[PDB]
Amino acid sequence: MYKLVLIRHGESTWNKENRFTGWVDVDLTEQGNREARQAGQLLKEAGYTFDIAYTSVLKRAIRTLWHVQDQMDLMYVPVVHSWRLNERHYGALSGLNKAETAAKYGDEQVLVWRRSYDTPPPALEPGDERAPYADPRYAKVPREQLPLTECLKDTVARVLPLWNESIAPAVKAGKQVLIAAHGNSLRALIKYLDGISDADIVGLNIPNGVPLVYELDESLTPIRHYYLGDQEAIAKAQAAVAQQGKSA
Numbered sequence: 001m002y003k004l005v006l007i008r009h010g011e012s013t014w015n016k017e018n019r020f021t022g023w024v025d026v027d028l029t030e031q032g033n034r035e036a037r038q039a040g041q042l043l044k045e046a047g048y049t050f051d052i053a054y055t056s057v058l059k060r061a062i063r064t065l066w067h068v069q070d071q072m073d074l075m076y077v078p079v080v081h082s083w084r085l086n087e088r089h090y091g092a093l094s095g096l097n098k099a100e101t102a103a104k105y106g107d108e109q110v111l112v113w114r115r116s117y118d119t120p121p122p123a124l125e126p127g128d129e130r131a132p133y134a135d136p137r138y139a140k141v142p143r144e145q146l147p148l149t150e151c152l153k154d155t156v157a158r159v160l161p162l163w164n165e166s167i168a169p170a171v172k173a174g175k176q177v178l179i180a181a182h183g184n185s186l187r188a189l190i191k192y193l194d195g196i197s198d199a200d201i202v203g204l205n206i207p208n209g210v211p212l213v214y215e216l217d218e219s220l221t222p223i224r225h226y227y228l229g230d231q232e233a234i235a236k237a238q239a240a241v242a243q244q245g246k247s248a
Contacts, residue, residue, distance in 0.1 A: 001223070002171050002216045005048065006179050006186055009064040010035035010209035018098050018243055020114075020121075022090030022150075023132060028063050035209030036064040040071030042228050043211055052078045052170055053178040054162070056085040056185070057137045064209065065180040083138055084162040087182035091121040091149025094130055103246040110244040116151065117198040123149040152201065155188040163189065168220060183241075186212075194222055207237030 010032030014021045028036070049072070055061045062081065069075045093101065093113060102110040113121045124131050125148075132138050132146045147154060170177050179189075183206050191201045193214065206212070211228040227234055 001218070002220075003048075004171060004177050004179070004214045004216060005043065005050070006181070006189075006212045006214065007039055007064065007068070007210065008183050008186055008206045008208055009058075009060040009180065010039075010067070012060045015208065020090040020093040020096055020098060020101070022087055022094045023058070024090075024094050024130060025058050026060060028060050032060070032064070032208065033067060036067030037071050039064075039209050039211050039228075040068040043068065044072045046228060048072075048211075049176060050074055050077060050178045051175040052080070053180060054080050054082065054085060054167055055180040056087070056182060057081050057083050058086055058182070061085070061087075061180050061182055065178070068178070068180065080166065082162050083141060084158055085179070085181045085185055086158075088152060088155040088184035088188070089147040089150035091123045091147075092125075092128070093121045094124070098244055099247040102244055107244060107246060114244050115202045117201055118151050118153045120149045120151040120154070152184060152188055152191070155185055156192060159185060159188050160192060163192070171216065171220065193220075194225075205238045205241040207234050207241060210234055210237065 009028065011029050012021065012032055013026045013029055014024070015032070016029050053065055053069070055065050065079065069077065098110065098114075112119050126133075128148075131148060133143060138146055147158075150158075167177060167179070179186075186206050187201060187204050190196065190204065196204070212225060213228060214225045215223045217223050
């Protein structure tokens with residue numbers, strides 16, 4: 001039997017301004033910093049330790065890891081930073097206000113864009129400032145593998161290699177692993193690990209900064225999973241995540 005812990009980054013500046021983020025590299029707010037610190041305390045008090053962590057190349061996930069490593073006294077552990085754990089790419093929605101966007105296109109359309117399995121948001125133009133091609137983070141990724149937008153199904157295809165080739169072998173080797181990442185990239189990994197159907201993944205929302213522990217059998221199949229923390233604080237967290245709602 002093995003344990004794997006997962007954590008969405010703490011509140012970001014764009015979670016607060018209610019803007020679709022994707023691969024735009026925004027930072028944590030003070031509240032997001034505190035969420036991260038608190039997740040570290042919670043794991044330290046529960047006795048958890050880690051031998052290795054995996055995260056994205058986006059600083060909001062990475063600063064969340066930093067805060068967890070700091071409160072846990074694990075600043076020395078190996079960290080693999082991978083573009084494959086990047087938040088699902090939000091195309092030409094990136095930067096737009098989610099409420100103003102539901103007001104223009106329909107609340108339905110915005111639910112498709114945020115939560116469906118296989119519908120992509122509209123794509124960036126290839127010369128959009130926000131396209132990834134000049135970014136040194138992705139200098140080694142061949143150009144055709146880089147998205148201008150992504151549906152969740154693409155996020156799954158992009159995450160699995162890291163899991164098959166690196167994270168699964170770490171877990172089996174006996175390493176105690178933390179993955180600090182993003183709402184939708186974690187939705188995607190969970191969809192694979194739990195065998196959640198295309199239909200059912202629509203409703204899964206993951207709150208900011210709450211450790212989520214998978215217990216895995218020897219074949220890496222989930223036995224159970226649970227959040228750590230106040231179950232009330234977090235039902236409220238997931239209730240706020242439902243903010244694809246139009247404004248006045």
